[PDB]
Amino acid sequence: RRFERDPTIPPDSIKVYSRTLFLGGITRSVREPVLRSMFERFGSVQSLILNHNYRHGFLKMFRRDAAEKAQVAMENVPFADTTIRTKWSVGFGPRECSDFSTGISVIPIRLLTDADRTWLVTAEYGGTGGLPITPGIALDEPDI
């Protein structure tokens, strides 16, 4: 688990690496079992939800490094009547604190909600692995 002292982090902040990818271009010809098999090449898929009414989906990998590999490989993939476009999702903490190009956030601890704080410490994957939230640490996205 990532619990990395990172001297690039400002005072009273943490850094969080998203494990979640946004999937764009999801027409009805693009189905969950096929996407799952595509992304399993890069590592174990923790969750995958498609919503064809919005032409999109969200895929979470157990590991941040697998998510990075999947994002670069699947960034623009012609498929049937569409192109699958894989980008980072930032679904944890304030979106104001994030680089959407890489799915990395630098979050002042004071802006975490109590729920955010609890998820960070209790997550099976990501988060602090049971340690307190303290400044200058980089973590992966917690399960909620």
Swiss-Prot record:
Asked whether the UniProt record includes Cell inner membrane among its keywords, one would answer: no
**Gene Ontology annotations for the cellular component aspect, listed alphabetically:** Mei2 nuclear dot complex; nucleus
Tell me the ranges covered by the RRM domain, including all copies. Answer: 19-91
Keyword Phosphoprotein carried by entry? yes
Q: GO:BP terms for this protein?
A: co-transcriptional mRNA 3'-end processing, cleavage and polyadenylation pathway; mRNA 3'-end processing; pericentric heterochromatin formation; regulatory ncRNA 3'-end processing; sno(s)RNA 3'-end processing; termination of RNA polymerase II transcription
Which residue ranges does UniProt annotate as crossing the membrane?
none
Any single GO molecular-function term of the entry would be: RNA polymerase II C-terminal domain binding
Residue stretches in coiled coil: none
Where does this protein reside within or beyond the cell?
A: Nucleus
Subunit info here reads: Interacts with rpb7.
Protein name (Swiss-Prot/TrEMBL): Rpb7-binding protein seb1
**Species of provenance:** Schizosaccharomyces pombe (strain 972 / ATCC 24843)
**Which gene codes for it?**
seb1
What stretch of the whole protein does this chain cover? 388 to 531 of 620
